[PDB]
Design a protein around this ligand. Structure first.
Ligand SMILES: [Cu+2]
Ligand SMILES: [Cu+2]
Ligand SMILES: [Cu+2]
Ligand SMILES: [Cu+2]
Ligand SMILES: [Cu+2]
Ligand SMILES: [Cu+2]
Lengths: 336, 336, 336
């Protein structure tokens, strides 16, 4: 169908790690789904010792919000760059076809907005990110990425075509940060975004992140902000990394069904311990919780996770299952 | 079945690169398979110029021994931390469900042991590793990891469901090491394990290993210690990397059937030149040797292999096959 | 069949990014396909500021030319090392079985040549590279790699066995370079290849490339040298990385069908945004262009692409399609 003749619907986005309400399988026909995002440049505290990032965001968050449509829908995004920002921006949707993912049609200087439509003709989780000519990596590594999820119109399916359904979706964006240090060995704090550029590029070129964070800060997804679930609930964990590879893992769990390349027309793999999100992509994993407790969800380069920040928590309520796991003998003195 | 009512069997582990005797397809019903491992902290020489690592091991080796069960069995591990060690330890089985892989139920201080049971309900090769709170990466990168192999009860299968059988299994654990240097440019040698910690963490955070070794040392799997096979033999090569990605390759061979994500309910890929083991996982490859000679088995970042240590040898006996490969003209002067 | 009794054919190679003419599906029976390559050591300018590499090539190019045969053919390569070169060389075909991929049978000192035959019994794209004992990574990272493509005799197939056909093939070799700097912060320029060795090895061991280039130089596949296509054309993009992982992506496009591990007997994945080429392998992607314009084809570590060089262009002619993508509102002032 010609999108000019299709029904339009507007979606209200929600901040990560939540995902806006949506159907999985749907009876709806194709629609033009309208979204708006407003770019916000801001200084963010990214760790527990006060380090700041001169950040750049879609909608005020790292990652930007997840946009969910169904295959055959059209995404119609209004991208707003307020006059309070300093830099030009745009958006490149990996789910889109043509014009550098839309970037060529969405160059917005501060004070401008633009509206792009594209057909979401391929199912999967797809990165979107800013990509202004001449400063693409800087915008991405400063925070400007998120996920478009294009669900099959009949929902997710296993390799045999059986329906998969999730009760809750969470979106995790993992950001490799390149925060400069000065000659005194301390991270630099910059008064403006532009002042951070040259020093950051030099760090970028070392390919060694200073920090690797989920959702904008060390510990973002811990404490009051841990993800939650219950025994018996099936969760979809969407993981995006717009610049650098990562290897997600749920400690004490699995990926029951995983699309690590993120494209739902391909059969998922089952029983994964750790999966692999290629830099420049989003993937997705389903897991049904079977044990209560506080899980970690992390990048299983354990240095990247525990030293650099790429780890969060999932607090799960419910009944312990001794068939799956039992402490036979608690820690005690070695028998003589 | 309730594991409390199942038969128990004890397995005697063997040191890598061998794997303890086991059946592939079995007629046995599910069992509780009992294993014991004893942690050993020790200083190890890891290269040919005398560099030492303040190492930490399961059962005295890097990797720890491979534990083999069948899907539906229960693993019942007694983990022993002798009083001669300095650090607390535990174990996280990626094959297990709950309690941070068992780590929360197996915290053993020196002088203690604990016994954990879990259902091996998912087939595959799975990493196990130590994970003590607050010092997880250090224990892993110091040597505390190995593989649990959970075989399908009817053995390995190809994508069409045809039986695959191996004649011999080898286990290769690849360890990215982070050995500090001092101001004189020499690797440091520490009197105690604890003394190595701060300096090591700083190296870890650079994400650049000093060494990347198979099975505990540069050249571990070479010379008298090369792996062996014969023409006609099918070998299973289990490869674990608990912290960092690797890309195994058999020079002059292939991965005939490879589960690079390591999970046997998924179809394997065939004819691989190089496969990919995500940090935090174990995978497995089958190969049937068709040519004699000394093969290399290595990480195909060739710098990681040849400069940093991630390479071993397989010495294969048998008859050369000129249909597969023939030297038509030996090296000789360029024709005029 | 015994290759000694098969028909022989000679192929004339072409320089990257083109691929020599070949059939996809063929009615031909198996043949011994004869190729010749001549090693050329030479100094190359690799970036826009005059940096040089003491390079080593097959046939004068980075990558070496792509060799195309069909499964069941035999490859019979004459490798020539002219007396004007300084180093010994050989060739390791990942598509071959035995003798370290042929390297043990092809050690040629300057002034020598050798001829190797092997059965191309496995379909896929496979790396070939030089591998002289004691200096393997140096030869590879200095430029000595390319691709052997072994097509199924009936052409490429989708997961259901439907025929895939491409109109044009391009070959992209991605090279992580390790160019030393001196104490003045400038890249070194060496008078001879041998003089570059020690300093290069030290850089290699940092695992941080100075440059990551397609096809021999920053910008090699841009400007007059951009890849080309038309709307409606299906292109096969062969991507080789003999030493280090990469993650190809077509900006504004997709991988319609991708064999990221490069082995055509396995089903491809569809709709990929970004795929993954393990260091030490070649993979292949098909894409049918649906929009005109200048695409980028790049490694989606965007720092590696835009800062270090791993990006090229595809200039595509044809008609813009507003169903796939439309600018609804051009950039304009934010509504009041
Ligand atoms: Cu931006
Ligand atoms: Cu992108
Ligand atoms: Cu430990
Ligand atoms: Cu783990
Ligand atoms: Cu060479
Ligand atoms: Cu190789």
């Amino acid at each position: 169908q010609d999108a000019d003749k299709l029904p339009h619907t507007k979606v209200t986005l929600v901040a990560p790690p939540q995902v806006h309400p949506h159907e999985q399988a749907t009876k709806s026909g194709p629609k033009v789904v309208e979204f708006t995002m407003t770019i916000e440049e801001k200084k963010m505290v990214i760790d527990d010792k006060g380090t700041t990032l001169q950040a750049m965001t879609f909608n005020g968050s790292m990652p930007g919000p997840t946009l969910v449509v169904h295959e055959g829908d059209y995404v119609q995004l209004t991208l707003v760059n307020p006059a309070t920002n300093a830099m030009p921006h745009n958006v490149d949707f990996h789910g889109a076809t043509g014009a550098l993912g839309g970037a060529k049609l969405t160059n917005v200087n501060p004070g401008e907005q633009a509206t792009l439509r594209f057909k979401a003709d391929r199912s999967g989780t797809f990165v979107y990110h800013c990509a202004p000519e001449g400063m693409v990596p800087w915008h991405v590594v400063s925070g400007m990425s998120g996920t478009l999820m294009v669900l099959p119109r009949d929902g997710l399916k296993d390799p045999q075509g059986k329906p998969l359904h999730y009760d809750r979706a969470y979106t995790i964006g993992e950001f490799d940060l390149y925060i400069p240090k000065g000659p005194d060995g301390k991270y630099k704090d910059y008064a403006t975004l532009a002042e951070s550029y040259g020093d950051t590029v030099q760090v970028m070129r070392t390919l060694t992140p200073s920090h690797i964070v989920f959702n904008g800060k060390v510990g973002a997804l811990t404490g009051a902000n841990a993800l939650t679930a219950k025994v018996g609930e099936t969760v979809l964990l969407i993981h995006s990394q717009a610049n650098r590879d990562t290897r997600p893992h749920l400690i004490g769990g699995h990926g029951d069904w995983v699309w690590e390349t993120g494209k739902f027309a391909n059969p998922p793999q089952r029983d994964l311990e750790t999966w692999f999100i290629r830099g420049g992509s989003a993937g997705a994993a389903l897991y049904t919780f079977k044990q209560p407790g506080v899980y970690a969800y992390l990048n299983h380069n354990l240095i990247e996770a525990f030293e650099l920040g790429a780890a969060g928590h999932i607090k799960v309520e419910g009944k312990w299952n001794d068939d799956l796991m039992k402490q036979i003998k608690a820690p005690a003195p070695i028998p003589r």
